[PDB]
Amino acid sequence: NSLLSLEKISYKPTGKTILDSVSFEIKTNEHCVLLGRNGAGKSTLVNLIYGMIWATSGTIRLFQETYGEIAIQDLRKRIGILDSSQRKLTVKDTILTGLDPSPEEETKTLQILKDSDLLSKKDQLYNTLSSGEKKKILFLRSIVNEPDFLIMDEPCSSLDLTAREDFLGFLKEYHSKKKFTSLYITHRPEEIPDFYSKAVLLKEGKVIHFGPIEECFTEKNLEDLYDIPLQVQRIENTWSVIPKQ
Amino acid sequence: NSLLSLEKISYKPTGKTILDSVSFEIKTNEHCVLLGRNGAGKSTLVNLIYGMIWATSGTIRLFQETYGEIAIQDLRKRIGILDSSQRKLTVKDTILTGLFHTIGYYRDPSPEEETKTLQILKDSDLLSKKDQLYNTLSSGEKKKILFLRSIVNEPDFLIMDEPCSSLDLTAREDFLGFLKEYHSKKKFTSLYITHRPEEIPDFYSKAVLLKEGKVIHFGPIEECFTEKNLEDLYDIPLQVQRIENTWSVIPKQ
């Protein structure tokens, strides 16, 4: 029941090692975080998982299959990506962009909106939604094709506290209602919902540690990651990571 | 010693009220934070304080002079701005781009201007990087240099508009360390704009809380940053506390 597996994955396309012998695994219905500083190689690793770049060594597998065994266009359909960085479309049409509009596709879109108590917004323009609601819609767009797993690339970027809580609340509700698999990418431990049970800590392209999130988020492992003394604790079921004076 | 004052500042350029009757003031050598939700109007307010847009009503003054009494070019010489949006220059060169150009009379830096910039770097223990290219600095270091640039004209006050943008925790610590060190050496006046309470250094003593173009509260920061006033700002139950000399504001479960 391994869904994603990386075994000593490296990426050295032009004499500089960008990813160095990366190993971790995500089982079916698990939720894993990839935590690292700005510039740690997280975007590169996502590119590799999504089949946009080939590893220069190691083995990567989706279920039982090495990436060599799967047509990349088929792999990409089976992996959903939420990343907001991607004139005047509605809620419905924005979601449809994640797949012209076949009827079957339209029905699917409306059901996904209905399952998440947001049908009433079907025709609201996307640009009028609150910042958090926009991310909820991009989440629905990321799962429109019913992927095997979802990559959420810094989905709380540019959300204030209230919007973050709105989005994360929608995530927690989706998780209570539906089994799925995910990899959540961030540099801010406070953006991580309580249902993430596993973590990969990435520093300068190397895994510092992978495993249960309580094992990774020790003071010592986070200090190695951030290179400064830290106070780590849990407050209100969030991770609080604050530099020491 | 009222240095900046806004009295009932409103901005309604085209049927929608973007700022509504904004009132606050900053005295000489005070450090004031503007904490607002995204979309609260913070960028508009900064633009108005920097003379880029005119208020639709109300009064804004630098010391005793209304903005109507000051040539906006002269206003801007007196207000430093640190903004990360506003290209292969050295550190020294980057600081020198901050010099005030009289309209139509741009000139290269004088010998004495070059010397003054080196003194700035020396005073902040960065002379050693004078010739290092700006684009090779760490992300927190770039913000230090932008701060130096912002004070090159010796302004009356400084606006730091989301200065921790693009900084991870380590880079933020680096830059905030530099700010605190600067503050320890020299009295100055500032307005720090953020949407993240954790980005606010300890020397900020006053705050303005902004929501949908309106001031929710203005006063001593401990008065503004009560659970009640922050729950009014953020519209959710919050746990507010101080941890390692930083503000922790965390949603309740």
TrEMBL record, chain A:
It comes from the Bacteria. Keywords: ATP-binding, Nucleotide-binding, Transport. PROSITE patterns: ABC_TRANSPORTER_1, ABC_TRANSPORTER_2. Residues 4-229 form the ABC transporter domain. The keyword Nucleus does not apply. Pfam families: ABC_tran (PF00005). GO terms for molecular function: ATP binding; ATP hydrolysis activity. This is ABC transporter ATP-binding protein. It comes from Leptospira interrogans serogroup Icterohaemorrhagiae serovar copenhageni (strain Fiocruz L1-130). The lineage of its organism: Bacteria, Pseudomonadati, Spirochaetota, Spirochaetia, Leptospirales.
